[PDB]
Enzyme design. Structure first.
Site, PDB file in Angstrom:
ATOM      1  N   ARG B  41       0.672  -0.913   0.137  1.00 28.14           N
ATOM      2  CA  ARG B  41       0.184  -0.168  -0.297  1.00 28.14           C
ATOM      3  C   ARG B  41       0.828   0.855  -0.194  1.00 28.14           C
ATOM      4  N   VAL B  89      -6.709   3.937  11.225  1.00 31.62           N
ATOM      5  CA  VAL B  89      -6.668   3.334  11.324  1.00 31.62           C
ATOM      6  C   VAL B  89      -8.191   2.015  10.584  1.00 31.62           C
ATOM      7  N   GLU B 161     -14.104  11.916  10.604  1.00 29.80           N
ATOM      8  CA  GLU B 161     -13.547  11.775   9.448  1.00 29.80           C
ATOM      9  C   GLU B 161     -15.406  11.673   9.215  1.00 29.80           C
ATOM     10  N   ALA B 164     -16.623  11.318   2.090  1.00 26.93           N
ATOM     11  CA  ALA B 164     -17.402   9.968   1.170  1.00 26.93           C
ATOM     12  C   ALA B 164     -16.564   9.622   0.432  1.00 26.93           C
ATOM     13  N   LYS B 220     -19.855  11.818  15.337  1.00 30.03           N
ATOM     14  CA  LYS B 220     -19.610  10.638  13.884  1.00 30.03           C
ATOM     15  C   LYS B 220     -20.340   9.392  14.050  1.00 30.03           C
ATOM     16  N   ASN B 224     -23.324   9.008  10.477  1.00 34.50           N
ATOM     17  CA  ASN B 224     -23.543   8.014   9.450  1.00 34.50           C
ATOM     18  C   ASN B 224     -25.059   7.845   9.885  1.00 34.50           C
ATOM     19  N   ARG B 260     -37.566  21.377   5.510  1.00 32.45           N
ATOM     20  CA  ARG B 260     -36.484  20.451   7.446  1.00 32.45           C
ATOM     21  C   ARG B 260     -36.859  18.969   6.460  1.00 32.45           C
ATOM     22  N   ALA B 268     -33.077   6.159  -3.920  1.00 35.73           N
ATOM     23  CA  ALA B 268     -33.312   4.842  -3.455  1.00 35.73           C
ATOM     24  C   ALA B 268     -32.282   3.734  -4.492  1.00 35.73           C
ATOM     25  N   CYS B 276     -18.513   1.071   5.783  1.00 39.80           N
ATOM     26  CA  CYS B 276     -19.251   1.907   7.338  1.00 39.80           C
ATOM     27  C   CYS B 276     -20.340   2.432   7.566  1.00 39.80           C
ATOM     28  N   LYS B 339     -20.404   2.387  -5.237  1.00 39.34           N
ATOM     29  CA  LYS B 339     -21.324   4.267  -6.122  1.00 39.34           C
ATOM     30  C   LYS B 339     -20.098   4.172  -6.552  1.00 39.34           C
ATOM     31  N   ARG B 437     -30.769   0.884  -9.655  1.00 37.80           N
ATOM     32  CA  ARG B 437     -30.385   2.163  -9.572  1.00 37.80           C
ATOM     33  C   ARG B 437     -30.902   4.029 -10.352  1.00 37.80           C
TER      34      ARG B 437
HETATM   35  N1  LIG Z   1     -13.470   5.331   4.101  1.00 33.92           N
HETATM   36  C1  LIG Z   1     -13.728   5.884   4.526  1.00 33.92           C
HETATM   37  O1  LIG Z   1     -15.007   6.922   3.518  1.00 33.92           O
HETATM   38  C2  LIG Z   1     -14.125   6.945   5.494  1.00 33.92           C
HETATM   39  C3  LIG Z   1     -15.047   7.760   6.195  1.00 33.92           C
HETATM   40  C4  LIG Z   1     -15.005   8.782   7.313  1.00 33.92           C
HETATM   41  C5  LIG Z   1     -14.160   8.006   8.376  1.00 33.92           C
HETATM   42  N2  LIG Z   1     -14.114   6.764   8.033  1.00 33.92           N
HETATM   43  C6  LIG Z   1     -13.373   6.004   9.221  1.00 33.92           C
HETATM   44  O2  LIG Z   1     -11.915   6.163   9.090  1.00 33.92           O
HETATM   45  C7  LIG Z   1     -11.509   4.988   9.343  1.00 33.92           C
HETATM   46  C8  LIG Z   1     -10.417   4.865   8.305  1.00 33.92           C
HETATM   47  O3  LIG Z   1     -11.547   4.161   6.977  1.00 33.92           O
HETATM   48  P1  LIG Z   1     -10.478   3.474   6.231  1.00 33.92           P
HETATM   49  O4  LIG Z   1     -11.755   3.431   4.556  1.00 33.92           O
HETATM   50  O5  LIG Z   1      -9.211   4.515   6.047  1.00 33.92           O
HETATM   51  O6  LIG Z   1      -9.545   1.531   5.963  1.00 33.92           O
HETATM   52  P2  LIG Z   1      -8.135   1.182   5.872  1.00 33.92           P
HETATM   53  O7  LIG Z   1      -8.720  -0.327   5.566  1.00 33.92           O
HETATM   54  O8  LIG Z   1      -8.872   1.826   4.067  1.00 33.92           O
HETATM   55  O9  LIG Z   1      -6.796   1.957   6.229  1.00 33.92           O
HETATM   56  C9  LIG Z   1      -6.867   1.236   7.579  1.00 33.92           C
HETATM   57  C10 LIG Z   1      -5.519   1.556   7.327  1.00 33.92           C
HETATM   58  O10 LIG Z   1      -4.462   1.085   8.545  1.00 33.92           O
HETATM   59  C11 LIG Z   1      -3.676   0.462   8.392  1.00 33.92           C
HETATM   60  N3  LIG Z   1      -4.124   0.552  10.251  1.00 33.92           N
HETATM   61  C12 LIG Z   1      -4.050  -1.108  10.704  1.00 33.92           C
HETATM   62  N4  LIG Z   1      -3.674  -1.212  12.225  1.00 33.92           N
HETATM   63  C13 LIG Z   1      -2.345  -0.705  11.901  1.00 33.92           C
HETATM   64  C14 LIG Z   1      -1.671  -0.241  12.602  1.00 33.92           C
HETATM   65  N5  LIG Z   1      -1.196  -1.156  14.396  1.00 33.92           N
HETATM   66  N6  LIG Z   1      -0.174   0.106  12.639  1.00 33.92           N
HETATM   67  C15 LIG Z   1      -0.035   0.721  11.335  1.00 33.92           C
HETATM   68  N7  LIG Z   1      -1.247   0.709  10.397  1.00 33.92           N
HETATM   69  C16 LIG Z   1      -2.713   0.301  10.697  1.00 33.92           C
HETATM   70  C17 LIG Z   1      -4.315  -0.884   7.576  1.00 33.92           C
HETATM   71  O11 LIG Z   1      -3.354  -1.772   6.974  1.00 33.92           O
HETATM   72  C18 LIG Z   1      -4.969   0.372   6.983  1.00 33.92           C
HETATM   73  O12 LIG Z   1      -4.345   0.632   5.213  1.00 33.92           O
HETATM   74  C19 LIG Z   1     -12.407   3.534   9.702  1.00 33.92           C
HETATM   75  O13 LIG Z   1     -12.611   3.856  11.573  1.00 33.92           O
HETATM   76  C20 LIG Z   1     -13.645   4.326   9.341  1.00 33.92           C
HETATM   77  O14 LIG Z   1     -14.408   4.067   9.795  1.00 33.92           O
HETATM   78  C21 LIG Z   1     -13.844   6.298   6.794  1.00 33.92           C
HETATM   79  O1  LIG Z   2     -50.605  17.002   8.296  1.00 33.49           O
HETATM   80  C1  LIG Z   2     -50.515  17.959   8.752  1.00 33.49           C
HETATM   81  O2  LIG Z   2     -51.313  18.571   8.732  1.00 33.49           O
HETATM   82  C2  LIG Z   2     -48.834  18.905   9.247  1.00 33.49           C
HETATM   83  O3  LIG Z   2     -48.261  18.309  10.250  1.00 33.49           O
HETATM   84  C3  LIG Z   2     -47.119  19.082  10.648  1.00 33.49           C
HETATM   85  O4  LIG Z   2     -47.573  20.000  11.453  1.00 33.49           O
HETATM   86  P1  LIG Z   2     -48.129  20.491  12.986  1.00 33.49           P
HETATM   87  O5  LIG Z   2     -47.777  19.171  13.492  1.00 33.49           O
HETATM   88  O6  LIG Z   2     -49.145  21.568  13.689  1.00 33.49           O
HETATM   89  O7  LIG Z   2     -46.017  20.729  14.389  1.00 33.49           O
HETATM   90  P2  LIG Z   2     -45.131  20.765  14.001  1.00 33.49           P
HETATM   91  O8  LIG Z   2     -44.483  22.002  13.610  1.00 33.49           O
HETATM   92  O9  LIG Z   2     -44.396  19.666  12.493  1.00 33.49           O
HETATM   93  O10 LIG Z   2     -44.972  19.969  16.030  1.00 33.49           O
HETATM   94  C4  LIG Z   2     -45.275  19.338  15.287  1.00 33.49           C
HETATM   95  C5  LIG Z   2     -44.940  18.024  17.453  1.00 33.49           C
HETATM   96  O11 LIG Z   2     -43.554  17.763  15.843  1.00 33.49           O
HETATM   97  C6  LIG Z   2     -42.503  18.271  17.921  1.00 33.49           C
HETATM   98  N1  LIG Z   2     -41.452  18.588  17.170  1.00 33.49           N
HETATM   99  C7  LIG Z   2     -40.760  19.571  15.977  1.00 33.49           C
HETATM  100  C8  LIG Z   2     -39.320  19.624  15.945  1.00 33.49           C
HETATM  101  C9  LIG Z   2     -38.576  19.749  16.531  1.00 33.49           C
HETATM  102  O12 LIG Z   2     -37.497  19.622  16.296  1.00 33.49           O
HETATM  103  N2  LIG Z   2     -38.951  18.711  17.515  1.00 33.49           N
HETATM  104  C10 LIG Z   2     -40.040  18.562  18.251  1.00 33.49           C
HETATM  105  O13 LIG Z   2     -40.277  17.739  19.471  1.00 33.49           O
HETATM  106  C11 LIG Z   2     -43.353  19.132  18.300  1.00 33.49           C
HETATM  107  O14 LIG Z   2     -42.998  19.781  19.642  1.00 33.49           O
HETATM  108  C12 LIG Z   2     -44.279  19.046  18.367  1.00 33.49           C
HETATM  109  O15 LIG Z   2     -45.302  17.815  19.389  1.00 33.49           O
HETATM  110  C13 LIG Z   2     -45.888  19.210  10.311  1.00 33.49           C
HETATM  111  O16 LIG Z   2     -44.974  20.253  10.390  1.00 33.49           O
HETATM  112  C14 LIG Z   2     -47.050  19.805   8.661  1.00 33.49           C
HETATM  113  O17 LIG Z   2     -46.280  19.838   7.712  1.00 33.49           O
HETATM  114  C15 LIG Z   2     -48.491  18.806   7.817  1.00 33.49           C
HETATM  115  O18 LIG Z   2     -48.642  19.586   7.353  1.00 33.49           O
HETATM  116  O1  LIG Z   3     -17.632   7.248   7.565  1.00 33.93           O
HETATM  117  C1  LIG Z   3     -17.883   6.529   6.671  1.00 33.93           C
HETATM  118  O2  LIG Z   3     -17.090   5.882   5.743  1.00 33.93           O
HETATM  119  C2  LIG Z   3     -17.960   8.366   4.873  1.00 33.93           C
HETATM  120  O3  LIG Z   3     -19.771   7.022   4.961  1.00 33.93           O
HETATM  121  C3  LIG Z   3     -20.450   8.289   3.568  1.00 33.93           C
HETATM  122  O4  LIG Z   3     -19.776   7.786   2.906  1.00 33.93           O
HETATM  123  P1  LIG Z   3     -19.016   6.793   1.758  1.00 33.93           P
HETATM  124  O5  LIG Z   3     -19.620   4.821   2.363  1.00 33.93           O
HETATM  125  O6  LIG Z   3     -18.115   6.969   0.660  1.00 33.93           O
HETATM  126  O7  LIG Z   3     -20.661   7.201   0.472  1.00 33.93           O
HETATM  127  P2  LIG Z   3     -22.172   7.719   0.418  1.00 33.93           P
HETATM  128  O8  LIG Z   3     -22.470   8.453  -0.607  1.00 33.93           O
HETATM  129  O9  LIG Z   3     -22.389   8.038   1.730  1.00 33.93           O
HETATM  130  O10 LIG Z   3     -22.959   6.579   0.699  1.00 33.93           O
HETATM  131  C4  LIG Z   3     -23.405   5.197   0.963  1.00 33.93           C
HETATM  132  C5  LIG Z   3     -24.146   3.648   0.039  1.00 33.93           C
HETATM  133  O11 LIG Z   3     -25.475   4.989   0.074  1.00 33.93           O
HETATM  134  C6  LIG Z   3     -25.528   4.716  -0.763  1.00 33.93           C
HETATM  135  N1  LIG Z   3     -26.490   5.909  -1.769  1.00 33.93           N
HETATM  136  C7  LIG Z   3     -26.406   7.183  -1.024  1.00 33.93           C
HETATM  137  C8  LIG Z   3     -27.594   7.867  -1.540  1.00 33.93           C
HETATM  138  C9  LIG Z   3     -28.229   7.578  -1.961  1.00 33.93           C
HETATM  139  O12 LIG Z   3     -29.596   8.361  -1.755  1.00 33.93           O
HETATM  140  N2  LIG Z   3     -28.572   6.242  -2.178  1.00 33.93           N
HETATM  141  C10 LIG Z   3     -28.121   5.345  -2.523  1.00 33.93           C
HETATM  142  O13 LIG Z   3     -28.310   4.451  -2.150  1.00 33.93           O
HETATM  143  C11 LIG Z   3     -24.648   4.971  -2.179  1.00 33.93           C
HETATM  144  O14 LIG Z   3     -24.134   4.336  -2.894  1.00 33.93           O
HETATM  145  C12 LIG Z   3     -23.050   3.864  -1.732  1.00 33.93           C
HETATM  146  O15 LIG Z   3     -23.625   2.631  -1.686  1.00 33.93           O
HETATM  147  C13 LIG Z   3     -21.110   9.455   4.425  1.00 33.93           C
HETATM  148  O16 LIG Z   3     -21.532  10.336   3.515  1.00 33.93           O
HETATM  149  C14 LIG Z   3     -19.928  10.139   4.852  1.00 33.93           C
HETATM  150  O17 LIG Z   3     -20.069  11.231   5.459  1.00 33.93           O
HETATM  151  C15 LIG Z   3     -18.699   9.048   5.712  1.00 33.93           C
HETATM  152  O18 LIG Z   3     -17.635  10.373   6.008  1.00 33.93           O
END
Ligand SMILES: NC(=O)c1ccc[n+]([C@@H]2O[C@H](COP(=O)([O-])OP(=O)(O)OC[C@H]3O[C@@H](n4cnc5c(N)ncnc54)[C@H](O)[C@@H]3O)[C@@H](O)[C@H]2O)c1
Ligand SMILES: O=C(O)[C@H]1O[C@H](OP(=O)(O)OP(=O)(O)OC[C@H]2O[C@@H](n3ccc(=O)[nH]c3=O)[C@H](O)[C@@H]2O)[C@H](O)[C@@H](O)[C@@H]1O
Ligand SMILES: O=C(O)[C@H]1O[C@H](OP(=O)(O)OP(=O)(O)OC[C@H]2O[C@@H](n3ccc(=O)[nH]c3=O)[C@H](O)[C@@H]2O)[C@H](O)[C@@H](O)[C@@H]1O
Ligand SMILES: NC(=O)c1ccc[n+]([C@@H]2O[C@H](COP(=O)([O-])OP(=O)(O)OC[C@H]3O[C@@H](n4cnc5c(N)ncnc54)[C@H](O)[C@@H]3O)[C@@H](O)[C@H]2O)c1
Ligand SMILES: NC(=O)c1ccc[n+]([C@@H]2O[C@H](COP(=O)([O-])OP(=O)(O)OC[C@H]3O[C@@H](n4cnc5c(N)ncnc54)[C@H](O)[C@@H]3O)[C@@H](O)[C@H]2O)c1
Ligand SMILES: O=C(O)[C@H]1O[C@H](OP(=O)(O)OP(=O)(O)OC[C@H]2O[C@@H](n3ccc(=O)[nH]c3=O)[C@H](O)[C@@H]2O)[C@H](O)[C@@H](O)[C@@H]1O
Ligand SMILES: [Cl-]
Ligand SMILES: [Cl-]
Ligand SMILES: [Cl-]
Ligand SMILES: [Cl-]
Lengths: 461, 461, 460
Positions: B41, B89, B161, B164, B220, B224, B260, B268, B276, B339, B437
């Site tokens: 690598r 890692v 991190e 994507a 984080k 996700n 919202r 879909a 992850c 993807k 897709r």
């Molecule tokens: N891949 C993503 O899109 C993404 C995005 C956000 C966060 N993350 C997080 O980031 C972390 C790493 O993801 P990744 O996709 O890069 O994994 P990865 O498997 O591709 O890379 C990790 C690397 O760490 C190395 N490694 C493991 N143990 C080691 C050690 N003891 N000393 C030195 N190297 C060591 C492995 O050999 C490997 O190359 C994960 O925890 C994951 O959840 C991943």
């Molecule tokens: O089906 C409908 O007729 C309506 O239902 C909801 O409207 P409403 O229930 O009057 O008001 P909201 O702002 O959605 O609040 C509903 C509940 O969610 C709670 N809430 C809302 C947001 C939030 O972040 N956290 C939370 O606990 C509010 O306190 C409340 O108890 C929708 O927001 C409207 O878009 C929709 O047209």
């Molecule tokens: O911790 C991680 O590894 C990362 O996981 C995702 O990134 P990633 O998995 O690389 O790619 P995404 O674009 O999120 O899609 C994940 C899966 O969902 C699918 N997807 C995504 C979006 C959507 O609308 N529908 C759908 O089917 C994609 O094709 C793929 O198979 C998150 O988007 C990142 O923010 C995060 O850092």
């Protein structure tokens, strides 16, 4: 009216060989060619030793074979030349994938459908005789529609089979009924009537039912599910009898004298076997689940669940009666075929009882008058466990020599005729007989006087 | 104020390579050394062919590599010299032991923590970038506290991190936000501010969030879980649409126009993949069970259960549409990456659909524009079944030649551009397209006119 | 292109009244007649005191009533004259039979359908304005088809309502989107287009979305389900925060800054209420079971089960904090409305928290600045109300001699209370349970005064 003059049957098994043999015998002017991918099966059909044991079959084959009855591995030319093509291939339960253990495996059918359209020109009637899920014919139609050629007219019919092994020739020569399904179109009804005209050479017209394609497919599954159900129901009653002192043979007679119930299929047993009852009910169950009919699915599943309880509890009976251990104990298994008058072992209870006892480390000595020993070895293999635990006996006396128990699993006539005094002398003591077929009824006092502990299904100990 | 001038990153994967490459590119005065136990690598990071395919990555590596960006297997000296050590890692689901299939595997993290304290003197900031269970940082702290040396001051931060794959460089150069967690102590806040000063070379200060260590770790997992949940929710709606004649793309648009809810992550699919989403939600579930929060555990488990239903039912769709059997049927798999715009296959739905079809004995021919064929072979291996059932195709037309079905699993742009008239000609008939897709939307009438049966998720047949 | 110039709306309720008043206000050249069987409701719409209180509504109504906006019990003439007939009747939950507690009751919709076809000749557009189960439009079409006459052409459209309580007029005048479903035939598309032209008097075309009818019907339920799911998701996270030393407000900010997630509907609470969310999610779950989609049914059921757990666990916290006994303990409930700035209590979390404490023998003193005390009594009735429940005139009464102060609704006034005054007259130890995160930033000083402070998504 169109006249079928050449018939091809794909599948030379327990259905295809006999059905075609009887058609050829009854219709001297129709050429009937039975085909199969299995060379040794086809070679056996052409030999003095047929690949299946069916009473009266050899006489029928020999009268027609080489005249208007043919067995061949040349599938393509048999299709090409045929007015009518039967699909009579196996439809087992899938042992893999989606619906594993439940769904029907339609891969042999599909292979036939593809091969037919590949090798067909002009007009042919294609008749689904194999037992299939309802609407399977629609898929054969779609494959044909999607693969048309100029002047190619393939008409699809349902024509399921009701023969039972052991009585195949009699069932085929004098069927309770013949069932034919096709669509209501002019061409569909023309196809139906042409196939009817074949059966009318020997089946009265009042015994030929014509329905739509789906009623016909469903009728076969339903018929088998009703038959299996009669057995599981009387087997459920056997357990109640054992618990109460009622006798299942007495109860069976009483219920069967009601003309609405009828007196057939009320013989209690260690359990129903044969290639189709379990798989056809499971197909029904699977299909019901797929059509969102879970209540119907669970109704029919009881038929299989009961059969499995009957078998398991019979095995438990043997082990419990033999002081709760059968490890290293010689046990005679008398009967390996799934019923008498066949050499077929497909899903025989004998297999399931044998495996249960082998799980315990019993030494089984197995006798059957018609099953080949090589088949019994295959059936019991996953084989080291078979080499260690199983012996195939040449006669029943050899099987019972130094045995703790005699276990009767198949209702061969010979078993009730055995010399049990002779058998008791060389058995280890105490000596047990476990009768899974009620064939020793009436001998119980004599057997007890000799010294046996005799147990049977549906009778209190 | 302390200034980070040397950075070491343990883990040269999809996170460590790109994150460090962008840091080096944006901070010309900071030495950034990416290290790994994986020699090939690291050797690839130093070559004309990077070990990962990420758009724009090669340009960033090449501009800095050998100037202020370094890749090395000398982990110890990179740690020894560093002001800041990133832990980047892998944290996979445990495939063994307690929590098998659910709990996070923290053995790579622990190995880093031990190695750091073994090779560290003086002041260093240790930054947990890997996705971890909440409170994992407390264990790194305990290991450091238990292994102090005179003048050794190791400060631990959370810095998860959000990139994507496929859009990594853009995500890293213009992040929606940067999140940093540390304790509220004077030293802790000093560490936080030093790491902030690194990101401030290119990220506006208003886009840098600072929290406590545990809020940061949890954020984080939650982020996700919310993203995965949006997909499983719209995928659940796809099933309802199919049953009603509603269209999921129409419904997605309607719901996403509510500001919202928002319009992102409502596409879909046959199902979400990637390394992850599933493991991070399962980590959340496991953690909830461990903290006696079973209601919360079962809430989040629905996200995984839905994803698995989406995939399974898509596979069932294929098998049901192909006359209930796919044994020996050639099927084209178009798309193996999880993807588009990555060569990563980790948890790709393509793997799960392929395995389902292989369980049936289908002959899969797999094309993907970026995944290496050796990876596809590894993914599908437990391999005899792979040698028997799987072919890796050079182009999509080869994949589809004599196929029964085309199954699109990855939304590569090229697939909608294919010559489907050409493809239909050499397909077996009837010909099916199964679009996992929604990339062929708008082509359905043309495809139907050509002769295909076209099916897609969230659209009634 | 066909011009709609007479609109009839069957149902002068909370959706129909305001929706039609805004249409008349924005489209002076359309005569808008709102009709109802309820004669006193109609007479009230023509009165100085409207039968629905919404900010801005009175001004909208009074600007056009008697000009191009009319309210009448003469349903048959309004139908007969209309180009477009909105069906804006209620679809209440079935309290009986198949789908009890979850299925929508279609009896009013069906009655309207039958009355429309009966009083109609020629061409009309018939539009579902009310929240309905998916494929309800098909039943209307079938009723129309079975009852056809020569030259009768009734086109069925879906046009759901997206009104939030208390903001109906602003939601109507400036909607995020207008949703219209019709079938993909020439006739259905001219019908869709005719209704688009009405909304285009005040809604940019880019914010008008046209779909098929089923997509439109399903979108309304899915939208509320996605909204309620955000709340249940952040609430689930709040419980984990309390277990881990994390703060749910910090987590909400962190996740909401992802523009794919967004920053709305992430305010943790004791639980969502209102007459829409639970009802529409339960309906969705029932529809899934009916369509044999059990995986989908139980996916969405979690939104409800999580809401119910959030309330349950909050009440248990109160009980466990008060040494597992609240028999005859005085407890102040501050907030009864389902959210702030309303007297609406429908499915309010305050009802459920109060009932849990009532089941333990607690003496509840309930203050709300806007909910009428008569509603509180009804809501807490099935005996135990007269025995256990007191409706306070101010929060200080409510807290006097109390063991705990429990905030269930996010009224801005509650953070302005004199908590030193409150602490003095509370029994000790004195507790505050903030179910709404309204006292964030008062935590330091409340602890100094001497409160034990308990909140959602944080240990203080
Ligand atoms: N891949 C993503 O899109 C993404 C995005 C956000 C966060 N993350 C997080 O980031 C972390 C790493 O993801 P990744 O996709 O890069 O994994 P990865 O498997 O591709 O890379 C990790 C690397 O760490 C190395 N490694 C493991 N143990 C080691 C050690 N003891 N000393 C030195 N190297 C060591 C492995 O050999 C490997 O190359 C994960 O925890 C994951 O959840 C991943
Ligand atoms: O089906 C409908 O007729 C309506 O239902 C909801 O409207 P409403 O229930 O009057 O008001 P909201 O702002 O959605 O609040 C509903 C509940 O969610 C709670 N809430 C809302 C947001 C939030 O972040 N956290 C939370 O606990 C509010 O306190 C409340 O108890 C929708 O927001 C409207 O878009 C929709 O047209
Ligand atoms: O911790 C991680 O590894 C990362 O996981 C995702 O990134 P990633 O998995 O690389 O790619 P995404 O674009 O999120 O899609 C994940 C899966 O969902 C699918 N997807 C995504 C979006 C959507 O609308 N529908 C759908 O089917 C994609 O094709 C793929 O198979 C998150 O988007 C990142 O923010 C995060 O850092
Ligand atoms: N056995 C019975 O008592 C009975 C009675 C009524 C109905 N059925 C039904 O009849 C059908 C056949 O039963 P069976 O007992 O004869 O099965 P079988 O296994 O004994 O015979 C089927 C034959 O078809 C052959 N075959 C499979 N695929 C082929 C192909 N593609 N081309 C050419 N040959 C092929 C096999 O090699 C085999 O010899 C089944 O669907 C069963 O459910 C059986
Ligand atoms: O939706 P919402 O929340 O606005 O409901 P809502 O309850 O506020 O109003 C619905 C209105 O529809 C009316 N209604 C029901 N069936 C009717 C019918 N067949 N003919 C005329 N009016 C009818 C009711 O009287 C009620 O005023
Ligand atoms: O589709 C099929 O394969 C066929 O299945 C059965 O024929 P078969 O299995 O050859 O033989 P059966 O006589 O029905 O008996 C099946 C099992 O039930 C057992 N059985 C039968 C009858 C009974 O009363 N009790 C009982 O235990 C038999 O010993 C055997 O194990 C049906 O009887 C046929 O009509 C059908 O065509
Ligand atoms: Cl038919
Ligand atoms: Cl015999
Ligand atoms: Cl901390
Ligand atoms: Cl591409």
């Amino acid at each position: 009216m169109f006249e079928i003059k050449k018939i091809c049957c794909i599948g030379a098994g327990y259905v295809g060989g006999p059905t075609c043999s009887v058609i050829a015998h009854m219709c001297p002017e129709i050429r009937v060619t039975v085909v199969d991918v299995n060379e040794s099966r086809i070679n056996a059909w052409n030999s003095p030793t047929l690949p299946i044991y069916e009473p009266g079959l050899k006489e029928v084959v020999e009268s027609c074979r080489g005249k208007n009855l043919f067995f061949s591995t040349n599938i393509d030319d048999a299709i090409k030349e045929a007015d009518l093509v039967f699909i009579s291939v196996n439809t087992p339960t899938k042992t893999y994938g989606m619906g594993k253990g439940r769904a029907a495996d339609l891969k042999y059918i599909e292979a036939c459908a593809r091969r037919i359209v590949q090798n067909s020109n002009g007009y042919k009637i294609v008749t689904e005789k194999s037992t299939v899920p309802v609407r399977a014919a629609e898929s054969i139609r779609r494959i044909f529609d999607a693969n048309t050629k100029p002047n190619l007219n393939l008409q699809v019919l349902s024509n399921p089979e009701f023969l039972a092994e052991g009585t195949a020739i009699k069932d085929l020569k004098n069927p309770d009924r013949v069932l034919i399904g096709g669509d209501e179109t002019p061409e569909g009804q023309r196809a139906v009537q042409a196939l009817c005209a074949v059966y009318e050479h020997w089946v009265p017209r009042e015994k030929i039912l014509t329905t739509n394609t789906w009623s016909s497919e469903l009728s076969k599954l339903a018929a088998n599910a009703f038959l299996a159900q009669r057995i599981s129901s009387i087997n459920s009653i056997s357990a109640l009898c054992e618990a109460t002192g009622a006798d299942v043979e007495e109860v069976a007679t009483a219920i069967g004298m009601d003309q609405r119930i009828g007196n057939k299929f009320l013989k209690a047993s260690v359990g129903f076997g044969g290639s189709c009852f379990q798989k056809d009910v499971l197909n029904l169950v699977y299909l019901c689940e797929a059509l969102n009919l879970p209540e119907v699915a669970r109704y029919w599943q009881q038929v299989i669940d009961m059969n499995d309880y009957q078998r398991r509890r019979f095995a438990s009976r043997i082990i419990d009666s033999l002081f709760n251990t059968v490890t290293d104990k010689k046990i005679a298994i008398l009967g390996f075929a799934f019923k008498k008058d066949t050499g077929d072992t497909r899903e025989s209870s004998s297999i399931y009882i044998s495996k249960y006892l082998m799980d315990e480390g019993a030494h089984l000595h197995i006798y059957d008058p018609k099953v080949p020993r090589e088949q019994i070895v295959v059936d019991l293999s996953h084989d080291d466990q078979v080499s260690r635990l199983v012996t195939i006996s040449k006669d029943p006396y050899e099987a019972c020599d130094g045995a703790h128990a005699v276990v009767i699993c198949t209702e061969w006539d010979m078993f009730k005729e055995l010399d049990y005094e002779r058998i008791h002398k060389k058995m280890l003591k105490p000596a047990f007989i476990f009768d899974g077929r009620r064939v020793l009824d009436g001998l119980h006092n004599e057997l007890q006087t000799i010294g046996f502990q005799i147990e049977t299904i549906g009778k209190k100990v």
